[PDB]
Structure formats: C-alpha cells, structure tokens
Design an enzyme around this catalytic site. Sequence first.
Site, PDB file in Angstrom:
ATOM      1  N   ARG A   1      -6.913   2.893   3.792  1.00  0.00           N
ATOM      2  CA  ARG A   1      -7.362   1.396   4.065  1.00  0.00           C
ATOM      3  C   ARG A   1      -6.246   0.129   4.015  1.00  0.00           C
ATOM      4  O   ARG A   1      -7.003  -1.089   3.917  1.00  0.00           O
ATOM      5  CB  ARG A   1      -7.555   0.885   2.072  1.00  0.00           C
ATOM      6  CG  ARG A   1      -9.000   1.858   1.939  1.00  0.00           C
ATOM      7  CD  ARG A   1      -9.256   2.085   0.594  1.00  0.00           C
ATOM      8  NE  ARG A   1     -10.702   2.437   0.418  1.00  0.00           N
ATOM      9  CZ  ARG A   1     -10.803   3.694  -0.763  1.00  0.00           C
ATOM     10  NH1 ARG A   1     -10.305   4.215  -1.470  1.00  0.00           N
ATOM     11  NH2 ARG A   1     -12.460   3.566  -0.533  1.00  0.00           N
TER      12      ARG A   1
ATOM     13  N   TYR B   1       0.884  -1.134  -0.178  1.00  0.00           N
ATOM     14  CA  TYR B   1       0.206   0.501  -0.264  1.00  0.00           C
ATOM     15  C   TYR B   1       0.590   1.290   0.037  1.00  0.00           C
ATOM     16  O   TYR B   1       2.252   1.313  -0.162  1.00  0.00           O
ATOM     17  CB  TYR B   1      -0.494  -0.136   1.443  1.00  0.00           C
ATOM     18  CG  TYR B   1      -1.989   1.148   1.224  1.00  0.00           C
ATOM     19  CD1 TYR B   1      -3.119   0.650   0.354  1.00  0.00           C
ATOM     20  CD2 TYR B   1      -2.020   2.228   2.361  1.00  0.00           C
ATOM     21  CE1 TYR B   1      -4.448   2.037   0.603  1.00  0.00           C
ATOM     22  CE2 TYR B   1      -3.319   2.814   2.245  1.00  0.00           C
ATOM     23  CZ  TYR B   1      -4.057   2.906   1.253  1.00  0.00           C
ATOM     24  OH  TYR B   1      -5.652   3.779   1.796  1.00  0.00           O
TER      25      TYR B   1
ATOM     26  N   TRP C   1     -11.652  10.764  -2.548  1.00  0.00           N
ATOM     27  CA  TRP C   1     -10.757  10.758  -2.349  1.00  0.00           C
ATOM     28  C   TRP C   1      -9.775  10.579  -3.177  1.00  0.00           C
ATOM     29  O   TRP C   1      -8.644  11.252  -3.180  1.00  0.00           O
ATOM     30  CB  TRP C   1      -9.524   8.976  -1.658  1.00  0.00           C
ATOM     31  CG  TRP C   1     -10.381   9.325  -0.385  1.00  0.00           C
ATOM     32  CD1 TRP C   1     -11.559   8.038  -0.621  1.00  0.00           C
ATOM     33  CD2 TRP C   1     -10.431   9.184   0.888  1.00  0.00           C
ATOM     34  NE1 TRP C   1     -11.948   7.979   0.547  1.00  0.00           N
ATOM     35  CE2 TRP C   1     -11.731   8.931   1.584  1.00  0.00           C
ATOM     36  CE3 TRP C   1      -9.606  10.371   1.532  1.00  0.00           C
ATOM     37  CZ2 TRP C   1     -11.478   9.024   3.034  1.00  0.00           C
ATOM     38  CZ3 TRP C   1      -9.570  10.688   3.314  1.00  0.00           C
ATOM     39  CH2 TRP C   1     -10.656  10.296   3.996  1.00  0.00           C
TER      40      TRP C   1
HETATM   41  C1  LIG Z   1      -5.027   8.370  -1.552  1.00  0.00           C
HETATM   42  C2  LIG Z   1      -6.261   8.916  -0.845  1.00  0.00           C
HETATM   43  C3  LIG Z   1      -6.042   8.894   0.701  1.00  0.00           C
HETATM   44  O1  LIG Z   1      -5.577  10.364   1.201  1.00  0.00           O
HETATM   45  N1  LIG Z   1      -6.275   8.467   1.623  1.00  0.00           N
HETATM   46  C4  LIG Z   1      -6.897   6.757   0.750  1.00  0.00           C
HETATM   47  C5  LIG Z   1      -8.007   6.687   1.566  1.00  0.00           C
HETATM   48  C6  LIG Z   1      -8.433   7.062   3.100  1.00  0.00           C
HETATM   49  C7  LIG Z   1      -7.240   7.214   3.699  1.00  0.00           C
HETATM   50  C8  LIG Z   1      -7.919   6.724   4.920  1.00  0.00           C
HETATM   51  N2  LIG Z   1      -9.078   6.423   5.050  1.00  0.00           N
HETATM   52  N3  LIG Z   1      -9.693   6.163   3.932  1.00  0.00           N
HETATM   53  C9  LIG Z   1     -10.183   5.033   3.582  1.00  0.00           C
HETATM   54  C10 LIG Z   1     -10.431   4.030   4.774  1.00  0.00           C
HETATM   55  C11 LIG Z   1     -11.569   3.212   4.716  1.00  0.00           C
HETATM   56  C12 LIG Z   1     -11.903   3.059   3.346  1.00  0.00           C
HETATM   57  C13 LIG Z   1     -11.518   4.399   2.655  1.00  0.00           C
HETATM   58  F1  LIG Z   1     -13.280   4.529   2.155  1.00  0.00           F
HETATM   59  C14 LIG Z   1     -11.257   5.456   3.279  1.00  0.00           C
HETATM   60  C15 LIG Z   1      -6.402   8.051   3.779  1.00  0.00           C
HETATM   61  N1  LIG Z   2     -12.594  -0.718  -1.945  1.00  0.00           N
HETATM   62  C1  LIG Z   2     -11.393  -0.830  -1.900  1.00  0.00           C
HETATM   63  C2  LIG Z   2     -10.768   0.274  -2.442  1.00  0.00           C
HETATM   64  C3  LIG Z   2      -8.992   0.260  -3.458  1.00  0.00           C
HETATM   65  C4  LIG Z   2      -8.995   1.664  -3.393  1.00  0.00           C
HETATM   66  O1  LIG Z   2      -9.410   1.804  -4.832  1.00  0.00           O
HETATM   67  N2  LIG Z   2      -7.834   1.799  -3.582  1.00  0.00           N
HETATM   68  C5  LIG Z   2      -7.043   3.196  -3.644  1.00  0.00           C
HETATM   69  C6  LIG Z   2      -5.818   4.346  -2.939  1.00  0.00           C
HETATM   70  S1  LIG Z   2      -6.600   4.293  -1.575  1.00  0.00           S
HETATM   71  C7  LIG Z   2      -6.684   3.103  -5.302  1.00  0.00           C
HETATM   72  O2  LIG Z   2      -5.917   2.053  -5.355  1.00  0.00           O
HETATM   73  N3  LIG Z   2      -6.337   3.820  -5.772  1.00  0.00           N
HETATM   74  C8  LIG Z   2      -6.584   3.804  -7.731  1.00  0.00           C
HETATM   75  C9  LIG Z   2      -5.399   4.420  -8.195  1.00  0.00           C
HETATM   76  O3  LIG Z   2      -5.528   5.852  -7.886  1.00  0.00           O
HETATM   77  O4  LIG Z   2      -5.182   4.097  -9.505  1.00  0.00           O
HETATM   78  C10 LIG Z   2     -10.209  -1.476  -0.956  1.00  0.00           C
HETATM   79  O5  LIG Z   2     -10.724  -1.390   0.245  1.00  0.00           O
HETATM   80  O6  LIG Z   2      -9.696  -2.636  -1.242  1.00  0.00           O
END
Ligand SMILES: CCC(=O)N1CCc2c(cnn2-c2cccc(F)c2)C1
Ligand SMILES: N[C@@H](CCC(=O)N[C@@H](CS)C(=O)NCC(=O)O)C(=O)O
Lengths: 199, 200
Positions: free
Chosen positions: B15, B9, B105
């Site tokens: 996540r 990650y 995000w």
């Molecule tokens: C690269 C994008 C970013 O800044 N983050 C990724 C998504 C995220 C962060 C913190 N919690 N979290 C998250 C946790 C669980 C479920 C979910 F949908 C999202 C920080």
């Molecule tokens: N529901 C999935 C979401 C996975 C996901 O969307 N992760 C993001 C980073 S937090 C990602 O890989 N983004 C795709 C990209 O930026 O290409 C999980 O919980 O694993």
Amino acid sequence: MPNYKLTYFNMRGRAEIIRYIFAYLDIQYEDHRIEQADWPEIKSTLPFGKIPILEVDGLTLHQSLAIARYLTKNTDLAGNTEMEQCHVDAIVDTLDDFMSCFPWAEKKQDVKEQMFNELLTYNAPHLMQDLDTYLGGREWLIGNSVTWADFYWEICSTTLLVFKPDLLDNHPRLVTLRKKVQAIPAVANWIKRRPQTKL
Amino acid sequence: GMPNYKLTYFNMRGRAEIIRYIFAYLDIQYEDHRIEQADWPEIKSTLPFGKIPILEVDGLTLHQSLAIARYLTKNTDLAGNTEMEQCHVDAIVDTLDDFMSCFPWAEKKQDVKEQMFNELLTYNAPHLMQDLDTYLGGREWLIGNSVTWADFYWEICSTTLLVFKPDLLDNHPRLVTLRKKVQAIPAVANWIKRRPQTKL
Ligand SMILES: CCC(=O)N1CCc2c(cnn2-c2cccc(F)c2)C1
Ligand SMILES: N[C@@H](CCC(=O)N[C@@H](CS)C(=O)NCC(=O)O)C(=O)O
Ligand SMILES: CCC(=O)N1CCc2c(cnn2-c2cccc(F)c2)C1
Ligand SMILES: N[C@@H](CCC(=O)N[C@@H](CS)C(=O)NCC(=O)O)C(=O)O
Ligand SMILES: [Mg+2]
C-alpha cells in the site's frame, strides 16, 4: 446550474454521504431510489456495475466517496487547508475501510451474523477508542468547522449503532459529535424528511 | 523551506508503493523507512489509527495511503486536469483499491486465506479486468489526455495481481500497454530499477 441525478437503492447505505452533502449545500437533485427489480437493467449499462452513481448534466460519475469529494470541492465542507483536506480524506477512508469489511451481500444469513458479530465485538471498540482519542476535546474531527468527515462519522456510526446499541457508551464525546451533526439545520431537516430504512 | 518527508511501511511495495511512485515522479526527496514484521507490534501502538503506511511531514503524521497520494498530487500534473476528471481519477483508484482490499491480507487461517485468494482471482478478477479494458478502450491513459496517479495505481495493483495470477492479462493487451507506458516513464523506470526487490 448543474442538473443532478443520484441513483441508489431505497436505503441510506453508501449513498447517504452524498445526500447529506446536497442537503448541506442546499443543492437540488433527484434522489432516484430503485427497487431491487429495476437494478439488473440499470447495472448492465454501468461501466463498473455498482451504485451509487451520480449523473451531472447527463454525465455519469461513480464511487460514493469520489462523488462526495467532488461535490465538496471549493466548499467549506472540504477542509480549510491542503493538509486538513488530507486529514478529512484519511478519516473518511478509515471509516469506509471498516464499514467495507462487513459482508453486506452474503446470502447465508448464518455466515453473515457470525462475521458481523466478530467485527462488532473485537474490531469496532478499537476503532471507537481511536476516534475518541483522535477527536480529544476538539469541536470537529478536522479543523475548526464541520467537514464531510463529520457527516461520514455520523452516518457510519448510525449504521453501527443499529447492530451494536452500546457502541458509544464509553465515548460521550463521539455521541456529542453525532448530535452536533444532527443539529445542523439542513442536516436535521434531511433526517426528518428522509425515508425510514433499516440501513 | 522544503518539507522533510518520512514514509513508514513494511519492506514491501504493498500500500506504500503509490506514495513511492509519486515522490519519484515529482522528484521529491524522502526517507523511505521500512520496518520489520518483528518491530511492527511496538510501532503500531504509537500510531493514531494503528495502520501503515504513515507519512511524516515536518514531524506531523499523515495516514491512509490514498489520502496521502491525493495530498501529494494536488495541483500537480498527476492530478486530473479538470475537477470532473479528478472525480474520475478518484473513482478508478477506489475501484482498484476496493478490489485489492477484498483480499484477506491479514487472515490468520492459511486455508481460509488461500481459498479466498483463489476465489477472488478465479471469478472476480477477470470481470474487473474486462470492465477496465472496456473503460480504457483505445485511449492512451485511463483518465484525460495525460498520465495521472490512477495510471500509477493501475500498474501497481496489476503488478500485485500478476504475482498471484500470471495469466491475468493475456486477453487484455491494451491494459498491458498501459502498464508498460507507466513503467517506461523515466522517473518511474528509475525507481523500478532501484527499489528493494520484494515479492509483494
Ligand atoms: C502484509 C500484507 C501483505 O502481504 N500485503 C499488504 C497489502 C498488499 C500487498 C500487496 N498489495 N497490497 C495492497 C495494495 C493496495 C491495496 C491493498 F488493499 C493491498 C502485500
Ligand atoms: N486503506 C488503508 C489500509 C492500511 C492497512 O490496513 N495497512 C496494513 C498493512 S498493509 C496494516 O497496517 N495492518 C494493521 C496491522 O497489521 O496491525 C491504507 O491504504 O492505508
Ligand atoms: C445492500 C447491502 C446493504 O444492506 N448495505 C450496503 C452497504 C451499507 C449499508 C449501510 N451502510 N453501508 C455502507 C456505508 C458505507 C460504506 C460501506 F462499506 C457500507 C447497507
Ligand atoms: N466503494 C464503492 C462500493 C460500491 C458498491 O459496492 N455498491 C453496491 C451497493 S451497496 C453495489 O452496487 N453492488 C453490486 C450489485 O449489487 O450489483 C462506493 O462507495 O461506491
Ligand atoms: Mg477505500
């Protein structure tokens, strides 16, 4: 023997996976469909105020996929090994994550069409390609027998095809997989007998 | 013998954190692989679904953070006690994940991103907190009579939300007590001390 009551709108939507599972396992249940008008009084009584819900012997469960997983536990729909169960869960979440991106509740019909269109044009083809590669020449998405991941694929792809008819023009293996789900006798029977809804 | 675990990650709780708490709690060794936002584009094109986290188990790739968490906790004390309690665990987790997943995000337009974050935190988040408060009531843990990975997920998600909205839980001391209890579990406490310090 458990008494089951499923509550959702008159719609396939997020309830359909549960409907397919009950059909496949030949489990009788009440398919309680509520017209929009009966929703406010039911919603007020629910811990999280969302549907679908499933009542099992008068105890309320919520979250469509949590319910789906509960109903398939200890059955052949679950996945044959622990790691296969993981792959089933993963495919389901991948599809659900994508379906969840669509602004279903958006009231401005103009904001909604712009968003649905962006998702279907740019995002959808990448997913279909990933699913196709993932499936390759195998019979089912996971393992050597049908799982609720196959059901969820058929359900989600049906919804997506309502908005983008040409979604699978380049993926005959994904079309075949839908047809395989659709030909399972209990599923076919359900498809024949269910109410016709856009979604 | 013992499976070789490699988690991939960003250098971020995000996540992946639920997986990390679970390994820590179950006292399982794993390689905590953290990638740079610069090395990301490459690795992405090699992943079956192009998302992280992924978990490699003896070289086989697993994906979907909650699918992985459920796989790691199956038959352990972190899963629900009964099949029915396992449903409640999954349902609470999806309720939390649904809400966190609403946040844009990845939104490339900063102004749009800010507007939606503010709206989610101002309107939606307090309603979800009240729902959870009523759900927990005076119980010790969210589900059943002992800690589950749902409690873990609560603590992780609420940690995230508190970054953006420090006052989120001022009216919910019982939800705070639960976070504190999760944070005090010795294996979790130990992890919280040693993990890389990141904003998110
Ligand atoms: C690269 C994008 C970013 O800044 N983050 C990724 C998504 C995220 C962060 C913190 N919690 N979290 C998250 C946790 C669980 C479920 C979910 F949908 C999202 C920080
Ligand atoms: N529901 C999935 C979401 C996975 C996901 O969307 N992760 C993001 C980073 S937090 C990602 O890989 N983004 C795709 C990209 O930026 O290409 C999980 O919980 O694993
Ligand atoms: C009431 C809003 C509405 O029109 N729909 C609800 C959501 C939905 C529909 C069809 N599929 N679907 C769905 C299925 C699974 C995951 C998901 F996120 C969405 C139709
Ligand atoms: N991830 C949840 C989402 C549930 C959900 O958002 N359901 C909608 C109906 S499609 C709902 O009840 N919305 C709240 C409302 O309309 O009052 C599930 O799969 O059960
Ligand atoms: Mg989800």
